[PDB]
Amino acid sequence: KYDIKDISLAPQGRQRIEWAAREMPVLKQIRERFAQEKPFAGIRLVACCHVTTETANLAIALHAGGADSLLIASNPLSTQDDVAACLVADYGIPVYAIKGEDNETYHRHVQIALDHRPNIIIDDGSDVVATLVQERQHQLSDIIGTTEETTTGIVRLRAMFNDGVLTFPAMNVNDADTKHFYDNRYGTGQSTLDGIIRATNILLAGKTIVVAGYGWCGKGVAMRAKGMGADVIVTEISPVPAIEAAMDGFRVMPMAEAAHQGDIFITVTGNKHVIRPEHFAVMKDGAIVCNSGHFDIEIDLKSLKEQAKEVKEVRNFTEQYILPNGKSIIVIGEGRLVNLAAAEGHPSAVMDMSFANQALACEHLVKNKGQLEPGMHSIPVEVDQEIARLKLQAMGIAIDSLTPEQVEYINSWASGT
Amino acid sequence: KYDIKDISLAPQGRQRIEWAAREMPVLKQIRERFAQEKPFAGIRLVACCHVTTETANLAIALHAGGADSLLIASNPLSTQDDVAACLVADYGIPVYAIKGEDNETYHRHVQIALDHRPNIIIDDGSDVVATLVQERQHQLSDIIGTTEETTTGIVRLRAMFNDGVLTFPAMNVNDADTKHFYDNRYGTGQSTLDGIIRATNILLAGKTIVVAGYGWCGKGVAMRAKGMGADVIVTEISPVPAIEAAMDGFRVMPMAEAAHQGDIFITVTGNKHVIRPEHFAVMKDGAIVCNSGHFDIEIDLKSLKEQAKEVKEVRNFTEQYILPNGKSIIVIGEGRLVNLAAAEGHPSAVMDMSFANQALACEHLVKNKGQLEPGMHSIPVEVDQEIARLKLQAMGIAIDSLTPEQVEYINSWASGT
Amino acid sequence: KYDIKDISLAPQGRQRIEWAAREMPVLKQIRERFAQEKPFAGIRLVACCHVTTETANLAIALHAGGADSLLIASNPLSTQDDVAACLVADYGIPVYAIKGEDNETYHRHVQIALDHRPNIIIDDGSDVVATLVQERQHQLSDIIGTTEETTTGIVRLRAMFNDGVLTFPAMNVNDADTKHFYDNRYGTGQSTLDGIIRATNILLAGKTIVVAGYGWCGKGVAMRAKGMGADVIVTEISPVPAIEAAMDGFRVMPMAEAAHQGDIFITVTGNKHVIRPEHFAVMKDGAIVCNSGHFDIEIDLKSLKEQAKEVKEVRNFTEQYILPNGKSIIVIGEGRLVNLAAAEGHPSAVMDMSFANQALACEHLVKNKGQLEPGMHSIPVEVDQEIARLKLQAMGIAIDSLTPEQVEYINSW
Amino acid sequence: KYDIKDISLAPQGRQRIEWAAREMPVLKQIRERFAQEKPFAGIRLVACCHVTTETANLAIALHAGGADSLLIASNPLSTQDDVAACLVADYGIPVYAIKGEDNETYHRHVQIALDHRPNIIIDDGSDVVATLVQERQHQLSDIIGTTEETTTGIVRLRAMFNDGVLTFPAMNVNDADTKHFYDNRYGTGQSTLDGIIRATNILLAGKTIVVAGYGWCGKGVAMRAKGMGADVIVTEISPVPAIEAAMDGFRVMPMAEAAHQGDIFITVTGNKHVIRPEHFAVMKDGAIVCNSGHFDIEIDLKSLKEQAKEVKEVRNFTEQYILPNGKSIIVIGEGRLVNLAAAEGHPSAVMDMSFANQALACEHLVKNKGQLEPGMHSIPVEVDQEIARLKLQAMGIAIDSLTPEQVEYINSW
Numbered sequence A, B: 001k002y003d004i005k006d007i008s009l010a011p012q013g014r015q016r017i018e019w020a021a022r023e024m025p026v027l028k029q030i031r032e033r034f035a036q037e038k039p040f041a042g043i044r045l046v047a048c049c050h051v052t053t054e055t056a057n058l059a060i061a062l063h064a065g066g067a068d069s070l071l072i073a074s075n076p077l078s079t080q081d082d083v084a085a086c087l088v089a090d091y092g093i094p095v096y097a098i099k100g101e102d103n104e105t106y107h108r109h110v111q112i113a114l115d116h117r118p119n120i121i122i123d124d125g126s127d128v129v130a131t132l133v134q135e136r137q138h139q140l141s142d143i144i145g146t147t148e149e150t151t152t153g154i155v156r157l158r159a160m161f162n163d164g165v166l167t168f169p170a171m172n173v174n175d176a177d178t179k180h181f182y183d184n185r186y187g188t189g190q191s192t193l194d195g196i197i198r199a200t201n202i203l204l205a206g207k208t209i210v211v212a213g214y215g216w217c218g219k220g221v222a223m224r225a226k227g228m229g230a231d232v233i234v235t236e237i238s239p240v241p242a243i244e245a246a247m248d249g250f251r252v253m254p255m256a257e258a259a260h261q262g263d264i265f266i267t268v269t270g271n272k273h274v275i276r277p278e279h280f281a282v283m284k285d286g287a288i289v290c291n292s293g294h295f296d297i298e299i300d301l302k303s304l305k306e307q308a309k310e311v312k313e314v315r316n317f318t319e320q321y322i323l324p325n326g327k328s329i330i331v332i333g334e335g336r337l338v339n340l341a342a343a344e345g346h347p348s349a350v351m352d353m354s355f356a357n358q359a360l361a362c363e364h365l366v367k368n369k370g371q372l373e374p375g376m377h378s379i380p381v382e383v384d385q386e387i388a389r390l391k392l393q394a395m396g397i398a399i400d401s402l403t404p405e406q407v408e409y410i411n412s413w414a415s416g417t
Numbered sequence C, D: 001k002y003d004i005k006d007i008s009l010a011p012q013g014r015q016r017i018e019w020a021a022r023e024m025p026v027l028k029q030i031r032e033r034f035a036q037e038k039p040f041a042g043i044r045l046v047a048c049c050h051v052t053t054e055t056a057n058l059a060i061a062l063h064a065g066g067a068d069s070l071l072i073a074s075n076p077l078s079t080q081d082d083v084a085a086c087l088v089a090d091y092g093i094p095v096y097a098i099k100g101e102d103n104e105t106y107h108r109h110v111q112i113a114l115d116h117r118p119n120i121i122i123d124d125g126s127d128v129v130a131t132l133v134q135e136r137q138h139q140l141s142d143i144i145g146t147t148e149e150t151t152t153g154i155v156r157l158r159a160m161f162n163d164g165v166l167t168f169p170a171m172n173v174n175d176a177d178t179k180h181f182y183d184n185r186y187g188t189g190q191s192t193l194d195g196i197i198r199a200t201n202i203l204l205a206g207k208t209i210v211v212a213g214y215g216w217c218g219k220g221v222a223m224r225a226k227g228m229g230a231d232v233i234v235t236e237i238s239p240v241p242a243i244e245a246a247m248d249g250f251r252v253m254p255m256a257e258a259a260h261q262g263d264i265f266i267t268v269t270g271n272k273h274v275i276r277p278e279h280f281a282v283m284k285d286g287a288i289v290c291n292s293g294h295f296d297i298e299i300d301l302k303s304l305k306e307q308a309k310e311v312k313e314v315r316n317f318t319e320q321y322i323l324p325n326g327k328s329i330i331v332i333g334e335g336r337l338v339n340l341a342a343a344e345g346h347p348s349a350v351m352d353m354s355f356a357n358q359a360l361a362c363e364h365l366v367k368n369k370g371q372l373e374p375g376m377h378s379i380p381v382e383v384d385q386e387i388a389r390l391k392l393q394a395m396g397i398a399i400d401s402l403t404p405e406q407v408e409y410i411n412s413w
């Protein structure tokens, strides 16, 4: 009925879940309304998320709303075993997630999740939805809709749409303003460095840190690396973010040129093989590589393993690969999302807004069942904006409002001298 | 045939125009192609722009393209008289612009510009287009299309559209990525502080600087104020930018609360009466107010003039208003765009991209004459992106490109474990 | 002969210790020379330090020099049990330090250390040196010199001197340029935020963080707090650093004013009761307080415990005090050094320079026995400067040198 | 008796001078007391300063104190002609300074100044003091004391001392905390970028800016360059500041390596020929070079003029040197202090503290006549500290003070 490491961890999990809730007031307000209105009565739901204290708070909100949920891990290394135990023991929510599970177990958990015959699927990376569409065409009648948490998953869903197989509504949670403006940027910025520091306790100041990608995540990682005293190099494939990085004070160059200069490399591109053997070959002795994109394939670790003569664990979450010429490359978190693998992921303050979008996106799918076209849907503007209003209020920040006279001016095109 | 301060200033103007061109290579490339292809042969054009060295380089590019142009000032205080002289004397381009001209002269220049019967109108603030639509309905057959440089003008054009009177194509230059991502942000950031410093030589470090608005301009002004050692307060009307400002490290509060704390106030909202008598009344003795939004109406200077018992000029571009209770309020640039009134406006590096958009937007209007719907048009993505590619190249910055294998991964929705 | 938690944790300690050595290249060379020259032959030593991977690497250097060393914890919560086990087990260095040891056990270890009859005492807070002066006047015959690692220890030594009881050479390690320009500033800046984040995983961006003190540590904490997106308030008692903080972009104000605004309070003053009952009473519901200065007494936790009707642990290293009106005050690390209590302390890069100073200051005391005047002695400038040169080289950074004509120009007027 | 450009510019000078006074509150109070006590009664004085609105406010303070003052320019390009006219016309203070005066005229003014037989000399670069020692040995009978405003002047005085010719009291104004912690750092940081921008209106964001020297000025310039979006490289000759720059996030390297990367070079070293012919030869086409340290000799412009086949003025304060291969080198301010040559120098806020030091250092020299030992004397700590207190108060910032028990805790060990 579940598959977890150790249910005796539930008390620790409960404590950390309650602490996380302190900065998730928006989701708390949503949970209390769900508790009354039960939008998910009779709905079966699968969530493929990072099994964290923040995901637990989302699961509790969906549970209050009546959802018959089943949670599986989005990544083998991000699972928090105490959280899994608490969800099973305290809430009776089936969880199939073991920190460190092998790929066979991960894939079996996806099969178990699809056997739940979900009506709603919350995905983080689109693994489950892709598996649904590829292997479970006979189940598609169950689907009211799905949601997608992260940028990599949105890219996959776009490919599904262009391939003609996205035959149901999918909510683009990642691209909501109150999601990727804060989660992807400020959350990833802090928690990526957190993971690197918990793994290595390395001094960031004075180090050359290479950030691959200058999108929402790259901007955050570079900003916080800079804030911690690092010399920051940015790599890119598109000129607009490249000019931005330069005018933000960072050096921009091709990865081949960055490869011999970086002390720490951090990939946040969403793309495959951004760091390759031709790069490993020129890296400093002891260069550190890690990834905060969704999938570890941003770094060609398979080639690194094949080239290296020895690999050994030298600290928690930290492996030293020794190359035939004696130089070493350090890898954190086995190349998996370093903030979640070596630390705890984003602080709950930003996950409050991301998972408020998840909850209200699920509600949107059910309230509009039978009225949404197949394909990708953006979060409604009014929902996006109300999440922002509520979060600003809960942060204790007050701002101004337009007067009628100011509205009159906006609408009066004739005036201006 | 023109109306300028002093044509003997042309040699100084020529020198400053040539210097500005050094960081406008993208526009230079466009000018050389226009010189060959003459896209504006037989076209009459009016430009209502800030009469700066950067605008002169745009005017020279349009002139090379065959445009029969006429230039008027977008603001009485932004005109550079040496630039006006050089355009008339060296290029024979009619200019109607005198730094410090009164409102009657400004309005007469708009009338002269409309009497040119332009086919294309480049506007900065939409004064000329609004006057065209309100007073010159009988001329609309001349119009191939117009362009708009700034955010205030886009807002006016939206009101014209909603009012049913935008009956021709208008290119939204401001909202091109290569325009407001750099011009509005990094350009305004540097040149606003430049104007304040040229006006007052005040030490920015240790001062509390209140930035009204956290859009593209507000982000830039806050970023550079912070970079110069100021304590930064941000005011807003919308929660998304408000949360952003907080997570960027700034204090966010209503203007009423900021009013008693700020040493320098900078308005960049695009809206009317953001600083009002109720704010003046609680400001520190010697508080400085200035505006970098397009129109000075962001500050209620009319009420300040009526309240004050004395006003006197205390330094270039700097007025001291003494209130009946003896406290003083300092105003820079008479509330007109402070970067252009008290300094030289944006550096040419960013105007290279803004005015490349202007030139290519004008070309777009002519090449597509008879095929564009009335209403607002965005800059085509391929044009926007090519400007970015060329600017990055001219900045000497190299970046990466996706491999076929990386493209295959983007398109393969099934893979990911 | 040792008092540790679990000797079976030694492999993990050695793992983390060698990892830490990777960015201790300067101390490596000093230890390499020590094993060749054995400065500390027949010299017994006590170290009262934080029991960390970096302190271990220092102890390994003194051992390499022939030192007969004994290590005790400087703070019951900073001790790393795997490091204590590795030292006892892989090097034969007696360690008396157990993470979370009570007050009795702490001073029982200080009594064991002085029963070692140390010739050299390395101190971090002036705790053992102050006990030696107080209770072991008969043992002063054995002291060649002592060293002090922290600002608070330097302040107490100055009072010992002014009191007329600093009757031996004391090396001011903290005030060496290569120590507190970097350790106190860059080290404390990063590792203090590290401790807060490991304790709470709180988002720092958008929070108001109040930093009490703008000395070396305060500058570092404020700089990194700001770098992580916080609105930073600085409190002070001296005008020069107060003006600096304002010109660095921070809001300077009295603590009574900061108390109603701060989301997180960090004390780095070296002084007693900087956060007081009258501040708790006006703090925001859920305000976090922690200390990175000395001991814990920077926060008046005794008064907080009296104002509060309930206290509970709510996360690792994190206590929630609930006041009668229902508002809470969060305390991290029981008011002890938050970087060492909730995390691992400074990265080894900065401790490389701090502990190279320690190792050479110990070398100085020994090589100048019976030649040192009583009182405090600063690190020699050449030593301080050589550490910087070695570190800069180890970091792979090259700089310029004056040409003969540039020298000739400095001399003419 | 005066040598200025145009006495009719005086109203504009007085306008700008009083504006500058608004953020010179500390100097205001000192001048207020001076007019009451007249410390400089019967005392003749020379000032060799930059002829700015802030220097004017200093001269007005010495005049208020009874000073018989004469002012000459410290740099032919820093002189503000309207300020010179206002001083002559509104206060009767002889000024010998003309913006853009040639070399002959400069030293003709230095000869006029010493013919004033000054009892006090305020110097900015040690120019007049070095001429007094060289040529006016007979006038040393008149010297009560002198003062020096800049690091370069301090270095030359040290050589005068070591040479055995500093036979009078010299006040080290530059090294007072309230002077170079702020003026040299925050003042130079802003006003150097101000000069570059007024000269060129170049976008600083996205440029690589090379800062030669990481002392007080270099830290300030690098900090603000970075704040304005530049990629900052720092060069150095000393390891301690080099490590600081790296830990502050800047790229540290030899100038030979920086020369091929920099878009803008800023020298703040105090030393000769820091940018040399072998650097010009590898610079990017259009690289900008300027100096904010001393004199101009930090950049080897003599060699540049020889490498170049042509030079032309291309904007105010801006020259383009074109080399035989067609590449250009841009020089701002003819290599003179770019903040003062192309802009207005430091804002008066920082000069408030620098010139309060000057005014009180002059008070010190006079009130201790015949009591000062020959050589350099630092600003008394109480004076330095009182300036900070007054400034902090004037800025509207309040801070804390220790309670009696907190004091009692500092003293116990």
Ligand SMILES: NC(=O)c1ccc[n+]([C@@H]2O[C@H](COP(=O)([O-])OP(=O)(O)OC[C@H]3O[C@@H](n4cnc5c(N)ncnc54)[C@H](O)[C@@H]3O)[C@@H](O)[C@H]2O)c1
Pocket (backbone or CB within 6 Å): A150, A151, A152, A153, A180, A183, A184, A188, A212, A213, A214, A215, A216, A217, A218, A235, A236, A237, A238, A241, A268, A269, A270, A271, A274, A292, A293, A294, A295, A337, A338, A339, A340, A346, B400, B402
């Ligand atoms: N670890 C976390 O907690 C977390 C949180 C949010 C998102 N993410 C992941 O981070 C990744 C990036 O997300 P985002 O929102 O920043 O995406 P984004 O689309 O906003 O930006 C990605 C950027 O990377 C650039 N890029 C692409 N390929 C590149 C290459 N080969 N080299 C250099 N730059 C390249 C793109 O041009 C773009 O600017 C995704 O995989 C996303 O799922 C992780």
Ligand SMILES: NC(=O)c1ccc[n+]([C@@H]2O[C@H](COP(=O)([O-])OP(=O)(O)OC[C@H]3O[C@@H](n4cnc5c(N)ncnc54)[C@H](O)[C@@H]3O)[C@@H](O)[C@H]2O)c1
Pocket (backbone or CB within 6 Å): A400, A402, B150, B151, B152, B153, B180, B183, B184, B188, B212, B213, B214, B215, B216, B217, B218, B235, B236, B237, B238, B241, B268, B269, B270, B271, B274, B292, B293, B294, B295, B337, B338, B339, B340, B346
């Ligand atoms: N001076 C320059 O050289 C220059 C350059 C570009 C744009 N501009 C002008 O700057 C202004 C702002 O442009 P932008 O591109 O940043 O626009 P924007 O739409 O990106 O942002 C404006 C911001 O102001 C906020 N705002 C609106 N009314 C407000 C109020 N009453 N109080 C506080 N915040 C308020 C909005 O919520 C928004 O976030 C416009 O007038 C534009 O034309 C000036």
Ligand SMILES: NC(=O)c1ccc[n+]([C@@H]2O[C@H](COP(=O)([O-])OP(=O)(O)OC[C@H]3O[C@@H](n4cnc5c(N)ncnc54)[C@H](O)[C@@H]3O)[C@@H](O)[C@H]2O)c1
Pocket (backbone or CB within 6 Å): C150, C151, C152, C153, C180, C183, C184, C188, C212, C213, C214, C215, C216, C217, C218, C235, C236, C237, C238, C241, C268, C269, C270, C271, C274, C292, C293, C294, C337, C338, C339, C340, C345, C346, D400, D402
């Ligand atoms: N946690 C760590 O790892 C670590 C490392 C090094 C030092 N420290 C400790 O941190 C403390 C500070 O060290 P430092 O080097 O910054 O000292 P410092 O002497 O350089 O600076 C202390 C500053 O605090 C100010 N101050 C004193 N009392 C104050 C009060 N009541 N309110 C506000 N400001 C006050 C002083 O004016 C001074 O500017 C010391 O106890 C030192 O031992 C901790």
Ligand SMILES: NC(=O)c1ccc[n+]([C@@H]2O[C@H](COP(=O)([O-])OP(=O)(O)OC[C@H]3O[C@@H](n4cnc5c(N)ncnc54)[C@H](O)[C@@H]3O)[C@@H](O)[C@H]2O)c1
Pocket (backbone or CB within 6 Å): C400, C402, D150, D151, D152, D153, D180, D183, D184, D188, D212, D213, D214, D215, D216, D217, D218, D235, D236, D237, D238, D241, D268, D269, D270, D271, D274, D292, D293, D294, D337, D338, D339, D340, D345, D346
């Ligand atoms: N422009 C202004 O308004 C202004 C104001 C104050 C001081 N200054 C001048 O600026 C200069 C620097 O003053 P400061 O207070 O920063 O001095 P400082 O002594 O504090 O720092 C100078 C730094 O330059 C470094 N240095 C010396 N020679 C070098 C070289 N060849 N290459 C690289 N680095 C080198 C030194 O190691 C030192 O760290 C002096 O000439 C001073 O008079 C100018």
Ligand SMILES: Nc1ncnc2c1ncn2[C@@H]1O[C@H](CO)[C@@H](O)[C@H]1O
Pocket (backbone or CB within 6 Å): A049, A050, A051, A052, A053, A054, A055, A074, A124, A125, A149, A150, A151, A174, A183, A294, A340, A344, A345, A346, A347, A348, A351, A354
């Ligand atoms: N603390 C966390 N809890 C749950 N999901 C997280 C956490 N941190 C990051 N994520 C999510 O994981 C996604 C990447 O797989 C990001 O889009 C982000 O929303």
Ligand SMILES: Nc1ncnc2c1ncn2[C@@H]1O[C@H](CO)[C@@H](O)[C@H]1O
Pocket (backbone or CB within 6 Å): B049, B050, B051, B052, B053, B054, B055, B074, B124, B125, B149, B150, B151, B174, B183, B294, B340, B344, B345, B346, B347, B348, B351, B354
């Ligand atoms: N240097 C300049 N030359 C011409 N136009 C400018 C300059 N600086 C700012 N502007 C423009 O003025 C507009 C505001 O009226 C901005 O959108 C910007 O594009």
Ligand SMILES: Nc1ncnc2c1ncn2[C@@H]1O[C@H](CO)[C@@H](O)[C@H]1O
Pocket (backbone or CB within 6 Å): C049, C050, C051, C052, C053, C054, C055, C124, C125, C149, C150, C151, C174, C183, C184, C187, C293, C337, C340, C344, C345, C346, C347, C348, C351, C354
């Ligand atoms: N990782 C660490 N190992 C040992 N001592 C440390 C560590 N981090 C900080 N310290 C020291 O602890 C002292 C504070 O008590 C500081 O002087 C500092 O040098």
Ligand SMILES: Nc1ncnc2c1ncn2[C@@H]1O[C@H](CO)[C@@H](O)[C@H]1O
Pocket (backbone or CB within 6 Å): D049, D050, D051, D052, D053, D054, D055, D124, D125, D149, D150, D151, D174, D183, D184, D187, D293, D337, D340, D344, D345, D346, D347, D348, D351, D354
């Ligand atoms: N505005 C100014 N007025 C007078 N002196 C100045 C000004 N700006 C900088 N200086 C001084 O010039 C010296 C550099 O020669 C510095 O010591 C600094 O104090």
Ligand SMILES: [Cl-]
Pocket (backbone or CB within 6 Å): A029, A030, A033
């Ligand atoms: Cl709700």
Ligand SMILES: [Cl-]
Pocket (backbone or CB within 6 Å): B029, B030, B033
């Ligand atoms: Cl082209």
Ligand SMILES: [Cl-]
Pocket (backbone or CB within 6 Å): C029, C030, C033
């Ligand atoms: Cl050695």
Ligand SMILES: [Cl-]
Pocket (backbone or CB within 6 Å): D029, D030, D033
């Ligand atoms: Cl006084």
Ligand SMILES: [Rb+]
Pocket (backbone or CB within 6 Å): A077, A078, A079, A080, A099, A340, A341, A342, A343
């Ligand atoms: Rb995990």
Ligand SMILES: [Rb+]
Pocket (backbone or CB within 6 Å): A305, A306, A307, A308, A309
């Ligand atoms: Rb292998």
Ligand SMILES: [Rb+]
Pocket (backbone or CB within 6 Å): A409, A410, A411, A412, A413, A414, A415, A416, B156
């Ligand atoms: Rb309007």
Ligand SMILES: [Rb+]
Pocket (backbone or CB within 6 Å): B077, B078, B079, B080, B099, B340, B341, B342, B343
């Ligand atoms: Rb102008």
